[PDB]
Amino acid sequence: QRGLAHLVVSNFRAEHLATATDAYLKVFFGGQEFRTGVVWNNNNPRWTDKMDFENVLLSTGGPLRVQVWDADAGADDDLLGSCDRSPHSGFHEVTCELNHGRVKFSYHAKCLPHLTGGTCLE
Ligand SMILES: [Ca+2]
């Protein structure tokens, strides 16, 4: 099958998210899902998570979706914002502007052998 790649997403951090924020991320690609921990009381959080999505369909299986949530203990959490990317092969630094502030992360996408092209369709 064409369009297949290894996808690893990392180096998650956010800026100016507010007035106190308790942020965590949910990160999706196709049917797969990761969730980070909560950084309590911080408008510029960083998370150490490395998210290996292993083999994915880079073309059709997307998008890569990052949700930035504010944990509210004893109530419903607040969705601060969300962004989508259609990943391309290589190494990429993403900046997602939110209504307030932004979230940043990197990803590496490498086509499976005998595939090439920016979305591994060739
Ligand atoms: Ca809650």
XYZ file of C-alpha atoms and ligand atoms in Angstrom:
123
model
C 0.000 0.000 0.000
C 1.074 3.557 -0.761
C 1.070 6.544 1.583
C 2.555 4.743 4.596
C 5.073 6.350 6.920
C 6.577 6.198 10.374
C 5.284 9.186 12.422
C 6.767 10.396 15.745
C 5.575 13.580 17.443
C 7.528 15.260 20.244
C 8.856 18.353 22.043
C 5.479 19.641 23.133
C 5.235 23.062 24.730
C 2.813 25.981 24.911
C 3.003 29.757 25.442
C 0.800 32.451 26.950
C -2.236 30.178 27.390
C -4.230 32.682 29.476
C -5.588 33.506 34.599
C -4.145 30.194 35.878
C -4.076 27.298 33.400
C -3.776 23.562 34.037
C -2.971 22.312 30.550
C -2.775 18.875 28.987
C -2.826 17.661 25.407
C -4.828 15.059 23.507
C -3.167 14.079 20.218
C -4.828 12.066 17.453
C -3.972 10.431 14.154
C -6.618 8.249 12.604
C -7.906 5.900 15.269
C -4.879 6.380 17.481
C -4.853 8.623 20.530
C -2.338 9.891 23.151
C -2.902 12.041 26.248
C -0.234 13.913 28.235
C -0.198 14.652 31.925
C -1.351 17.941 33.431
C 1.025 20.792 34.177
C -0.672 22.510 37.113
C -0.837 26.312 37.396
C 1.281 27.305 34.437
C 0.564 29.396 31.359
C 3.760 28.233 29.611
C 3.735 24.450 30.108
C 6.091 21.877 28.652
C 5.512 18.130 28.428
C 8.134 15.421 27.947
C 5.901 13.039 25.977
C 7.211 11.318 22.850
C 4.320 10.029 20.803
C 5.209 7.264 18.399
C 2.259 6.731 16.046
C 4.257 3.959 14.352
C 2.962 3.099 10.853
C 0.362 5.533 9.557
C -1.339 6.453 6.283
C 0.137 9.909 5.905
C -2.057 10.863 2.978
C -5.557 9.673 3.917
C -5.275 8.763 7.597
C -4.936 12.276 8.941
C -5.015 14.814 10.027
C -2.628 15.004 12.944
C -4.871 16.721 15.494
C -3.638 18.393 18.732
C -6.176 19.530 21.346
C -5.074 21.804 24.170
C -7.217 21.281 27.290
C -7.425 23.127 30.632
C -8.128 20.675 33.466
C -10.798 21.928 35.854
C -10.912 19.675 38.906
C -14.458 19.186 40.064
C -15.923 20.383 36.742
C -15.622 19.853 32.975
C -12.324 20.589 31.351
C -12.009 23.540 28.953
C -10.907 23.128 25.344
C -8.479 26.006 24.852
C -8.002 25.208 21.195
C -7.208 22.620 18.561
C -5.149 22.384 15.407
C -4.760 20.078 12.445
C -1.808 19.298 10.225
C -1.468 16.991 7.234
C 2.049 15.659 7.890
C 4.654 15.541 5.155
C 7.857 13.522 5.136
C 10.909 14.997 6.852
C 11.338 16.951 10.069
C 8.892 19.697 10.942
C 8.305 22.312 13.612
C 4.650 23.152 14.107
C 3.248 26.306 15.701
C -0.509 26.346 16.298
C -1.898 29.718 17.248
C -4.751 29.506 19.705
C -7.246 32.219 20.620
C -4.844 32.913 23.448
C -1.230 31.904 23.023
C 0.023 28.930 21.095
C 1.135 25.315 21.241
C 4.327 24.080 19.557
C 5.694 20.646 18.760
C 7.866 18.780 16.289
C 7.313 15.684 14.196
C 9.338 13.333 12.108
C 7.706 11.413 9.255
C 9.695 8.857 7.271
C 8.194 6.916 4.364
C 8.236 3.120 4.588
C 10.791 1.482 2.295
C 10.204 1.733 -1.481
C 7.847 4.678 -0.985
C 8.699 8.276 -1.580
C 7.176 11.704 -2.103
C 6.054 14.227 0.462
C 3.124 12.036 1.437
C 4.769 8.732 0.536
C 2.445 8.053 -2.405
C 5.132 7.403 -4.999
Ca -12.315 18.077 35.210
